[PDB]
Design a protein around this ligand. Sequence first.
Ligand SMILES: Cc1cn([C@H]2C[C@H](O)[C@@H](COP(=O)(O)Oc3ccc([N+](=O)[O-])cc3)O2)c(=O)[nH]c1=O
Ligand SMILES: Cc1cn([C@H]2C[C@H](O)[C@@H](COP(=O)(O)Oc3ccc([N+](=O)[O-])cc3)O2)c(=O)[nH]c1=O
Ligand SMILES: Cc1cn([C@H]2C[C@H](O)[C@@H](COP(=O)(O)Oc3ccc([N+](=O)[O-])cc3)O2)c(=O)[nH]c1=O
Ligand SMILES: Cc1cn([C@H]2C[C@H](O)[C@@H](COP(=O)(O)Oc3ccc([N+](=O)[O-])cc3)O2)c(=O)[nH]c1=O
Lengths: 182, 184
Amino acid sequence: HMAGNDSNLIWLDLEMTGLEPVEDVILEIAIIITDSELNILAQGPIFAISQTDDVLDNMNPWCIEHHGKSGLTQRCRDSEVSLAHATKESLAFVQEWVPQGKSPMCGNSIGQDRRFINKYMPDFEDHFHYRNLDVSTIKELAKRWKPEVLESVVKTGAHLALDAIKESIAELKVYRELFFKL
Amino acid sequence: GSHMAGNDSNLIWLDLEMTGLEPVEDVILEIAIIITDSELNILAQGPIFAISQTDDVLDNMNPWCIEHHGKSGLTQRCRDSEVSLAHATKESLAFVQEWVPQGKSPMCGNSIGQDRRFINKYMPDFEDHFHYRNLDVSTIKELAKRWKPEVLESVVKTGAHLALDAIKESIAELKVYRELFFKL
Ligand SMILES: Cc1cn([C@H]2C[C@H](O)[C@@H](COP(=O)(O)Oc3ccc([N+](=O)[O-])cc3)O2)c(=O)[nH]c1=O
Ligand SMILES: Cc1cn([C@H]2C[C@H](O)[C@@H](COP(=O)(O)Oc3ccc([N+](=O)[O-])cc3)O2)c(=O)[nH]c1=O
Ligand SMILES: Cc1cn([C@H]2C[C@H](O)[C@@H](COP(=O)(O)Oc3ccc([N+](=O)[O-])cc3)O2)c(=O)[nH]c1=O
Ligand SMILES: Cc1cn([C@H]2C[C@H](O)[C@@H](COP(=O)(O)Oc3ccc([N+](=O)[O-])cc3)O2)c(=O)[nH]c1=O
């Protein structure tokens, strides 16, 4: 394939037990590679990470109500997948598709996700350039500079990690068309 | 121009110097803050602090750091300082509270997520004034690299030294993108 292109992009999204990685942990991870024009080249290996029920039945109330209602809390018990499992097979996918230190990490408020990857999945982190490509930076500029662009952005729920990433890419495509001057 | 003070669309820009890349071990050496309106006009420049650190600290930071902070006399300003981080945090919080409502402004700058790591560990009271989002000018840099690299000729790079001048640099970079890369 024309994979390994220097300008290819790694997008990802995590679900977690909450906002503070000091104590909280990673529940689900997904990965999409695009070319630089945002064409999805590959959906990588999705993972629920297995944790116990003392972990799962002691989140914040935002997390019990929404990981329950999406069937993720239940998928975590089902899984017998480790973090070092997810890590090795995430970094694997990503070595095929793009080089090393080339792509930033891409998604909405991707810095928050990066806090968890840094602590818990360092080997995966080291493949990335140190920069983020945070689509919410663009959303914050559009709010102030051209707010009506946001009518064309699509918000369809929350869902799995996978469809969240696709919402992020799609959000950026809208910007590419209506907000950037290429 | 206190006219614009309190406007919900104001942006908080900052830059930090640290003793390295890893907040687990490293500490903050300097903080500078600039407030702009949503159209990037500078409304107010914040008190600049070199944070007091002992000689133990200054003399054993990584070699990049003794090199460049040595180079710039930040190291020296840090030895001269009696300014505690608590103090800087208190001053900085009061300053931003004057210019923008709580929860409104993302944190703004180049690779600003990195700074927010140290802000979050060491100055959580100041972090609470910000919206949870970042406005990261280097995101736009990475888009420009791929979609319209020629805009980057118009971005002005220049020297570190001041944390204030690193910030004015980011603002200026975004002004450039505003003009050449965004439709608006
Ligand atoms: C919003 C939110 C998120 N989280 C954690 C748990 C999640 O695994 C993770 C992010 O999930 P997300 O689905 O991206 O969170 C959001 C869901 C909806 C919206 N929104 O469009 O109103 C924004 C963020 O961060 C929390 O712990 N509490 C919260 O209030
Ligand atoms: C409410 C809240 C949320 N978060 C993180 C966890 C969420 O995953 C993230 C939400 O990011 P965003 O910039 O508000 O919003 C989006 C997420 C996804 C999409 N999308 O187009 O798939 C759009 C916006 O924000 C925080 O880090 N702190 C918070 O207080
Ligand atoms: C680049 C770099 C940074 N750091 C730590 C100490 C610094 O105080 C802190 C902040 O980085 P910075 O002082 O703002 O340095 C740079 C700013 C912009 C650019 N640039 O030209 O893209 C390079 C460095 O990060 C290091 O410890 N080593 C480094 O090589
Ligand atoms: C090499 C390296 C650098 N950094 C930090 C050091 C700096 O604090 C920060 C600089 O990020 P950037 O995206 O390269 O920053 C810029 C700052 C100002 C301007 N400008 O011309 O206005 C451009 C880029 O990135 C890291 O966080 N990790 C690293 O491994």
